[PDB]
Design a protein around this nucleic acid. Structure first.
Lengths: 116, 164, 89, 92, 166, 205, 98, 161
RNA sequence: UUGACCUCAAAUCAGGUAGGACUACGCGCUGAACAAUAAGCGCAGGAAAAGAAAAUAACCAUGAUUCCCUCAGUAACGGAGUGAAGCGGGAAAAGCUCAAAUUUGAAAUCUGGCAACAUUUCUUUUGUUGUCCGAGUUGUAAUUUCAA
RNA sequence: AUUGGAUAUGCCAUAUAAAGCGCUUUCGAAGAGUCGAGUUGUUUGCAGCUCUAAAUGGGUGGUAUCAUCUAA
RNA sequence: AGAGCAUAGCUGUUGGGACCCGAAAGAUGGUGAGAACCAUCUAGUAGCUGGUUC
């Protein structure tokens, strides 16, 4: 049993086309969602800042985005993670606010019945 | 085998006379049939469509979860339990729960009569919570009769292991 | 940490009687320091420990004989053996 | 202290011919009552208060809402000519 | 609700009421066939919490398997073979005696329109759920094959991955 | 009543959830060489050690043996005397159960052994306590059930580089000791003043 | 500008935060209705044959006998201790009445 | 080689040829019309997003970017407000101008009362005044639906407009 | 005598569905010699399985699953040999549905027949509306899933 | 000739309706022959067998009380 | 007052069928009627035999 990698260039191209196929479907919006900034959970890496999964409910509440609309504008929600320190809260609230400063949200049509 | 007291209590049911009086009051409080409800609703629909305040309906209460809820809230005045529920565990706790809440209760014969009152094929339990002011005396008389014929009677065999 | 006073009090509280016979206690404290510097060397350590054990066994056997208690296991008697015969075989 | 005693009911027990040195039956238990009388140790007293402390919703003091949803739906069908009115049914 | 009473009563598995009923019902169930249709679940609380709804397209079947592989898993596969037009949803223990263990299986008809129009059970209609009990995709099947999360619960290691540039 | 034919000493044997093959085998072997040891079920709570006294009181065992396993790899042995008493913690390493083949001893099951203690046990008060406690526990008291008055084994405790080495030997007629098979190292961790409780009075360091 | 600097270091200045309790951690809390339902069911359903043995042992003192029996059937001592306290309360409630 | 493939070789029937092999081909844009008009079908999606003044990823990039030419304190974060951000390119300005002009057009968020709502609130106002809504809600006869003070206030507000 | 309900039935009653084949890649139940392998048996799809923590960790904490790289030929087991995982870096990212609390001022729910009206990859496919019957109170909808 | 998602624009829209975010002198249900214990095999898992639970409980970790999770 | 890391070639060596070839295992699943026969595991093997190319 030997696993060959002759399809390594083919997989590189296939993933690139998936990125372009996705961008064709969603024309003006980014192909990835915004990820939070977290700290790896060990003494070896806790000084590094890496990308998280989603923003905590306390982060979203502070930034002014409700958890029901956060997913609609591309902000992932992590119900599992929590803010044990005020630094993680401030690092990711600013990340959300900067995200909302650069965001153009196109309006949607709404059904308005003629009567009351 | 020997029947446990919780299951043996379902062999002693309400007698002929008191059960007849029970279903006579119940038949005055039958729920609105699917047909009758439709006529009343379209009548209001015609009033709404052309141009347009009622009273709270009075009827018997049915459904196991609904009736057990009413007993726990002490809203029920009389609970009638079918004596032949096929899995007996659905009602085996009902007489004791009616005892804990101080709700008058009786074990009437068969579930077909209970279902007929509510326009269904089968009702495991019925409960009466509210009656009109003219039926207060009739309900009070039945509560006394149920107590005298079912609670005052027996009350010693329901603690004994029946069968065998 | 290493409270000598506390340990001494605990030793006195749980001290076995001194008048208790050695046969009843089945304990040996023969004056033979088994010091084996070559701890890693199994042969050196085993010989040092066996010398104290041999002296302890001989002293206990003499004490058992003087106590009118049968020390040697009779061959005729057949009792359960803790050691697994199958494992040895 | 526990005295390191030994109960008379422990699982372990004491005692070619094994005589060299020293240091089943169907017995019943007792006439026991297998069918004890029902013992009401909890419902011998009446609980005077409702079990649930949840507040009463306003839906139980107002006309039914799902009936109103049906009434508006029926009225719409009458306006759209989908359901024959009671007068129309009577005259037909 | 009355299902809190039924769930609590089912924990007293050999009280006076439960032992008498289990003895009585075991005698009856042995009179009928090995696999026989149940008009309604004997444990309406347990069937209800395992996904069963009292509506058309939901079928309850009882089965007995000899005691002395998992017994619940054996009940599911035999019942699923018995009515091969249905999808096995779940199963639960209802009774046992010295000789037999009795189980009830909840089956769902994937061709009935009350099932195909319910989005909450629509998933079972898809062909990837054909004979879930035969591939260990039921609750007991998942438990039987050690599927779970944690440290409590090979081909990629026996291979030799050889990259292009290595 | 309180106790019928009360034997002087009794041993309660327990373990924690997570014992391994060697740890289970050593526990079974130790029970085999312990005629009046009452083997018990697993202890549910790996933290609540106050229940050991109640378990000992219920089973009338004055000595408690606890085989606590952590990380599924290391094995610890707790020995204490039910009534208050000193709780001493050990680390068990160099496991060699009866499954091996080097051992060739032959000792009668339940036979009263001879406990030989090194003079180093008298060097320090804490070592005096552990020697006295081991003598009271390991030594089978007279009158114990299933015990054998004959002697066919000797237990030796050799203190090496601060660690106690347990060796069981066989007496051969001529002493020419032959190893019974139980071989492990007793590494003291800490000794307490109460039954699995109270302030720690000795730290091995 | 939106973008994550994925390198190391953000600042060693740290200050703890106070978090509330998640609703999952409330599991195991006893409800008033649930305790009522369990008491009703415990009375309606009888007692197991082993529970009747433990109850008759407790009545005639013999506490060590009851604890040993409960541990043998249930398993761990924690389960046995809980059953004795439960069955003792059942006896006392019954003895107050019958 | 397989008997199925040998079978169709021996047949006199033509093969079901399909021609879908064209790599280097990038998906054409549907969805936004402004993006499609300004899209460059040759450039990659990163090159097009950057030219259009958009962000292809709100996070880091997991490799080296292409370089074609030799280029020459919690209080003040939860309370600060950032006044959006400039539109770098013309394409973003079209997107922003289109968004605001559609939001202004679809901005009627005030619901006028219906025939029933008008009569319902009118009967309550003409009896319990205008400024007291708590007494309006506590009425049982006129307020049969048992609306609370907030809903009656909204019925008043919608009646005004 | 009749009726309600339950149970057992029957029917060339109406409408559906299962089997068998292929199995490179899924997933199961098994199972030798020498490998948790071959073979045997069962069950699928375009992927399958897994999956939104009864998960890690001991940190400034992480955050469904899957896959790749690394961890690492390391820890551990048992000297040989067997041989992981947390972290870390990537690919892709999406979350949710019930059981358990009375709609109780109204079974608000659903299948089927019949009759119209549409609709079609399609006279071949899909529905909608009305009416009647049935299902269902031993519980069908709305509401809730602990992140609440 | 088929169909994707959108956009724009008509006609209808059963809204007496349905949601998100504030607040609380009011409440807050959580899956059992299952977990688990003992004993036999296969390989900690799985299974058989005997027994059989709990509600701030239960699981899993670091303590050798704390942390984390919320199964059937 | 660090000399290593990476790649390539060479040589040696340890594993993989492992320079080629040569004795029957055994097991699994079938066919025919104890024995026989068939197909795969399986490149299970020869401390050796024979051969091994300007």
């Amino acid at each position: 049993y030997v696993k060959t990698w002759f399809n390594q260039p083919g997989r590189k191209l296939r993933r690139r086309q998936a990125r372009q196929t996705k961008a064709a479907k969603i024309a003006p919006r980014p192909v990835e969602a915004i990820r939070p900034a977290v700290k790896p959970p060990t003494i070896r890496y806790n000084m590094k800042v890496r990308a998280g999964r989603g923003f905590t409910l306390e982060e979203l509440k502070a930034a002014g985005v409700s958890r029901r609309v956060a997913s609609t504008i591309g902000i992932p929600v992590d119900h599992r993670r929590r803010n044990r320190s005020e630094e993680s809260l401030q690092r990711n609230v600013e990340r959300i606010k900067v995200y909302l400063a650069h965001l153009i949200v196109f309006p949607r049509k709404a059904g308005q019945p003629k009567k009351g | 085998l020997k029947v446990p007291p919780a299951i043996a209590q379902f062999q002693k049911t309400l007698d002929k006379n008191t059960a007849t009086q029970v279903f006579k009051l119940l038949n005055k409080y039958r729920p609105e049939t699917a047909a009758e409800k439709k006529q009343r609703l379209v009548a209001e629909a015609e009033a709404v469509a052309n141009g347009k305040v009622s009273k709270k309906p009075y009827n018997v209460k049915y459904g196991l979860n609904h009736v057990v809820a009413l007993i726990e809230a002490k809203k029920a005045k009389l609970v009638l339990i079918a004596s032949d529920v096929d899995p007996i565990e659905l009602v085996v706790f009902l007489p004791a729960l009616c005892k804990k809440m101080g709700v008058p209760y009786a074990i009437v014969k068969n579930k077909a009569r209970l279902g007929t009152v509510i326009h269904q094929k089968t009702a495991a339990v019925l409960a009466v919570t509210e009656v009109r002011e003219e039926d207060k005396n009739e309900l009070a008389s039945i509560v006394s009769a149920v107590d005298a014929n079912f609670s005052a009677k027996y009350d010693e065999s329901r603690r004994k292991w029946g069968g065998g | 940490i290493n409270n000598t006073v506390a340990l001494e009090n605990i030793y006195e509280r749980i001290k076995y009687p001194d008048d208790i016979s050695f046969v009843e206690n089945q304990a040996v404290t023969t004056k033979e320091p088994i010091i084996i510097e070559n701890v890693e060397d199994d042969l050196a350590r085993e010989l040092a420990f066996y010398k104290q054990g041999v002296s302890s066994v001989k002293a206990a056997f003499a004490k058992l004989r003087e106590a009118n208690v049968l020390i040697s296991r009779p061959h005729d008697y057949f009792a359960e053996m803790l050691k697994s015969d199958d494992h040895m075989e | 202290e526990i005295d390191a005693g030994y109960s008379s009911d422990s699982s372990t027990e004491d005692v070619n011919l094994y005589i060299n040195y020293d240091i089943q039956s169907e017995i019943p238990d007792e006439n026991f009552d297998p069918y004890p009388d029902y013992d009401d140790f909890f419902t011998n007293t009446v609980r005077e208060t409702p079990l649930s402390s949840a507040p009463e919703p306003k839906r139980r003091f107002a006309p039914s809402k799902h009936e109103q949803k049906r009434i508006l739906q029926l009225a719409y069908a009458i306006r759209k000519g989908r359901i024959l009115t009671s007068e129309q049914r009577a005259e037909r | 609700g009355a299902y809190k009473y039924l769930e609590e009563l089912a924990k007293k598995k050999q009280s006076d009421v439960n032992l008498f009923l289990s003895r009585v019902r075991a005698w009856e169930y042995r009179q009928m066939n090995v696999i026989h249709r149940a008009s309604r679940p004997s444990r309406p609380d347990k069937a209800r919490r395992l996904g069963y709804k009292a509506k058309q397209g939901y079928v309850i079947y009882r089965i007995r398997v000899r005691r002395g592989r998992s017994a619940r898993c054996t009940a599911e596969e035999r019942v699923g073979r018995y009515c091969s037009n249905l999808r096995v949803l779940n199963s639960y223990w209802v009774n046992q005696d010295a000789t037999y263990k009795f189980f009830e299986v909840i089956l769902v008809d994937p061709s009935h329109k009350a099932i195909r129009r319910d989005p909450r059970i629509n998933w079972i209609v898809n062909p990837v759920h054909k004979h879930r009990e035969s591939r260990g995709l039921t609750s007991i099947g998942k438990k039987s094959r050690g599927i779970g999360k944690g440290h409590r619960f090979w081909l990629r290691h026996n291979t030799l991955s050889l990259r292009r540039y290595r | 009543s309180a106790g019928f034919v009360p034997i002087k000493q009794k041993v309660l044997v327990l373990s924690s959830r997570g014992v391994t093959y060697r740890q289970r085998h050593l526990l079974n072997d130790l029970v085999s060489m312990m005629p009046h040891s009452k083997k018990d079920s697993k202890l549910d709570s790996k933290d609540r050690l106050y229940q050991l006294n109640e378990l000992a009181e219920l089973y009338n065992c004055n000595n408690i043996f606890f085989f606590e396993s952590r990380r599924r790899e290391d094995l610890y042995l707790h020995i204490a005397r039910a009534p208050n008493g000193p709780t001493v913690k050990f680390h068990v390493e160099n496991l060699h159960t009866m499954d091996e083949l080097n051992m060739t001893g032959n000792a009668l099951k339940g036979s009263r052994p001879i406990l030989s203690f090194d003079k180093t046990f008298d060097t320090a008060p804490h070592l005096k306590v552990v020697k006295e406690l081991l003598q009271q526990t390991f030594g089978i008291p007279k009158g114990a059930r299933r015990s054998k008055p004959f002697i066919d084994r000797v237990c030796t405790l050799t203190i090496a580089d601060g660690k106690i080495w347990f060796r069981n030997y066989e007496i051969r007629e001529n002493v020419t000791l032959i190893e019974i098979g139980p071989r492990f190292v007793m590494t003291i961790i800490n000794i307490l003043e109460g039954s699995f409780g109270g302030p720690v009075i000795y730290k091995n360091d | 500008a939106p973008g994550l600097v994925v390198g190391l270091n953000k600042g060693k200045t740290l200050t703890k935060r106070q978090l509330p309790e998640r609703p999952s951690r409330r599991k195991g809390h006893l409800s008033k209705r649930t305790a009522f339902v369990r008491s009703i069911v415990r009375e309606v359903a009888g007692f197991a044959p082993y529970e009747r043995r433990v109850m008759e042992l407790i009545r005639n003192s013999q506490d060590k006998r009851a604890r040993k029996l409960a541990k043998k059937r249930l398993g761990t001592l924690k389960r046995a201790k809980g059953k004795i306290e439960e069955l003792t309360s059942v006896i006392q409630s019954s003895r107050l009445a019958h | 080689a397989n008997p199925r493939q040998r079978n169709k070789q021996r047949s006199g029937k033509p093969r079901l040829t399909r021609r879908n092999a064209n790599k280097k081909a990038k998906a054409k844009i549907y969805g936004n019309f402004v993006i499609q008009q300004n899209w460059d079908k040759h450039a990659t999606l990163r090159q097009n997003y950057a030219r259009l003044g958009l962000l292809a990823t709100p996070n880091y990039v997991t490799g080296g970017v292409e370089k074609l030419y030799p280029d020459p304190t919690l209080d003040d974060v939860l309370d600060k407000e950032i006044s959006i951000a400039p539109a770098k390119t013309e394409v973003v300005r079209q997107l922003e101008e289109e968004a605001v002009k559609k939001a202004a057009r679809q901005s009627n968020k005030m619901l006028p009362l219906s025939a029933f709502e008008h009569a319902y609130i009118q009967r309550l106002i003409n009896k319990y005044g205008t400024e007291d809504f708590e007494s309006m809600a506590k009425d049982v006869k006129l307020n049969s639906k048992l609306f609370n003070g907030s809903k009656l206030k909204n019925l008043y507000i919608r009646m005004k407009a």
